[PDB]
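Inputs:
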Amino acid sequence: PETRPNHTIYINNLNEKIKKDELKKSLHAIFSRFGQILDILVSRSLKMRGQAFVIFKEVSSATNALRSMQGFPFYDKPMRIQYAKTDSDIIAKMK
RNA sequence: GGCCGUGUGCCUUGCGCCGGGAAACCACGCAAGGGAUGGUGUCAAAUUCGGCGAAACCUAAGCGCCCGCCCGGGCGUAUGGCAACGCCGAGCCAAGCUUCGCAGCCAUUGCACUCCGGCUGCGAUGAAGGUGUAGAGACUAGACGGCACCCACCUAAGGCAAACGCUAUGGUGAAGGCAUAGUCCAGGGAGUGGCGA
RNA sequence: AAGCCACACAAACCAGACGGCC
Ligand SMILES: [K+]
Ligand SMILES: [K+]
Ligand SMILES: [K+]
Ligand SMILES: [K+]
Ligand SMILES: [K+]
Ligand SMILES: [Mg+2]
Ligand SMILES: [Mg+2]
Ligand SMILES: [Mg+2]
Ligand SMILES: [Mg+2]
Ligand SMILES: [Mg+2]
Ligand SMILES: [Mg+2]
Ligand SMILES: [Mg+2]
Ligand SMILES: [Mg+2]
Ligand SMILES: [Mg+2]
Ligand SMILES: [Mg+2]
Ligand SMILES: [Mg+2]
Ligand SMILES: [Mg+2]
Ligand SMILES: [Mg+2]
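Outputs:
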């Protein structure tokens, strides 16, 4: 459902078949229509497959994303988004 | 096919010894002998281009000595050879392992910020080992080769055990294959000529 | 020398360590 606001957003239930470097392109573009985007972490490991972390410059780019993008059918899959349950290493190196 | 020798290799034994190893055991240097060297399964591909090294055995150009000197000889000797075989640079290689690609199936609904789930199919890599290295060589298999497993034996670091101790992920079970078993062909048997002393 | 290199080729047989003698 929902967590507590954070710069980065946890996306899961993605299409596990799509390649690492390819999925980042489909993410950086599709989520930039809210604001500036930092980095995107995608792993293919048994634990991290079908999951991706998208980092925004501000909560404003993130809050709108979570709402306007929740359920957004990505590669025939109901893209599920949550707020990050722990601050990203990228951001914590500034705060 | 037999014996008799010679060298080189091999293992065993003894003796030595900066060594690696927890130990067994390997490694190294030598001398002497030939008594012993487990089993099943699996791979068969690359097989190229160069270079170094070499004992016995073959021969004596030059050199030394001798036949008092010439001519001829004679004796010695490899720096000339044949060659068992020790190797190096680069390339290449089947199956099996190291790590990455691509495809499929299995599972996975998973919160990460360093990298990572399994297998099967080709693609490429890395460590072995091989190829190079047969009488010019050509092709077939397999083993003495590569790989996996089993067995006998030694050892017991670690792991286990309160403890006598237990137990291989450690070792030992030769080298040959610089052509092994085969078919074939070059070579000698058995020609002429050249280079060469 | 020993060997090595060319073309030529008859057989058993010997040849993929060397020297003997069968
Ligand atoms: K011998
Ligand atoms: K020692
Ligand atoms: K060889
Ligand atoms: K022990
Ligand atoms: K030979
Ligand atoms: Mg014997
Ligand atoms: Mg073949
Ligand atoms: Mg060959
Ligand atoms: Mg003379
Ligand atoms: Mg004279
Ligand atoms: Mg002599
Ligand atoms: Mg010589
Ligand atoms: Mg060669
Ligand atoms: Mg022994
Ligand atoms: Mg061979
Ligand atoms: Mg041989
Ligand atoms: Mg043979
Ligand atoms: Mg002849």
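Remarks. Strands of chain A lie at 8-12, 37-42, 52-56, 73-74, 77-78, 80-83. Residues 10 and 82 of chain A are 5 Å apart (CA to CA).
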